Symmetry: D2
Subunit: 123 residues, 4 copies
């Protein structure tokens, strides 16, 4: 039961800010602000997490999406982060991500960036 452990404000290694609420039902809702790329201000996110994780010391699996459209800009792209929450004194969300841009069929080979973000509760 990591609803309280997940909910809150998280920061990654780029200085991006992830503001999330975890629902009792497994939902993730909030906003993402990227420190880099074709982005400004906050963007909607949604996602899901395992609301009944294993009790053996394993992390808590979760994921979320941002489409990079808001009232300021549209980067015609979406990122998905997939990862796990690891609780404790220095809690962390360890993620890998896929960023797809909309492309023509001819350029679709080149549509998707992959990377990895680690989030902490301290900047």
């Amino acid at each position: 039961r990591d609803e309280a452990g997940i909910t809150g404000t998280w920061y990654n290694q780029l200085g991006s800010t992830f503001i999330v609420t975890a629902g009792a039902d497994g939902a993730l809702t909030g906003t993402y602000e990227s420190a880099v790329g074709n982005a400004e201000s906050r963007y909607v996110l949604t996602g899901r997490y395992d609301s009944a994780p294993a009790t053996d010391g394993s992390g808590t699996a979760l994921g979320w999406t941002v489409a990079w459209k808001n009232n300021y800009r549209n980067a015609h792209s979406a990122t998905t982060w997939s990862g796990q929450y690891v609780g404790g004194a220095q809690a962390r969300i360890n993620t890998q991500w896929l960023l797809t841009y909309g492309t023509t069929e001819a350029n679709a080979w080149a549509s998707t960036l992959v990377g990895h973000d680690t989030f902490t509760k301290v900047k």
Copy 2:
């Protein structure tokens, strides 16, 4: 404006079924049923898509998450698909995905599978 083009029932190459509604606001909601893996019946999904895509022939970026917990089972894992919708006679959603399982810190190197799913409106 691909709200009508996205909304509906989609099937991938594995015979999985993706049932989605696209909101005017960029939301994706629905259910996923996997034909493979530690899964049975339907699981909640949510996600986002570019509600104002480019008009140059590019695809429509989107993503969504499933956490693999429902009333039947809990696979302590989450998958994120990231991709684009390509409209037309044979419409398609072309995706890559990341499946993270909850692990101990010692096994976290091995936590994440990557793959690729192509969805069609016909089985």
Copy 3:
């Protein structure tokens, strides 16, 4: 023992041409010619494969790299394909790949594309 099954000329879905020799010792050597991207003519490749695969119907794991420098151009990038060879009437190499471009530290978040290529012995 898939040395004879791997060695030869392969083509992917983009119309790229992969010319490989598999060594008894697990080596892969040859040349790659991409139909797309910042590339022309042939580039050196090397890689490795499992020279003693399982006999249970499993595929044969393998991988290879291309750095995108030759006498014509230098795209300051390297792609790695990781996958498996599946023997038989319609033999295939099913791969996923990572293409890293050299970046400054500020842009390294955006350095790596991911995709998937399927190779056949017929175009």
Copy 4:
């Protein structure tokens, strides 16, 4: 020209040891010893790097493969790392990797793990 900067012994965050020689011609040769997984002792590697990188502060793209067969064991798998070398006082190779295991056609959806390794010249 990073031939001297790449050649040598590198260690990642898992305590794996990567011993590589960079050739003037773009080759990478050496041995890999994993601290984790179905592995013991050293395994052959080969790969490629950009021997004429940009002079603007960008990193040096490179990649390499290991098939996880040696005289001790065979894990019927191959990993490819794709990344860049970043020179200087605290030199680093920043990589993402794809590990494919040989599978039956029914389980091929689950064949490939993805992760990220950072190598340093100090443990």
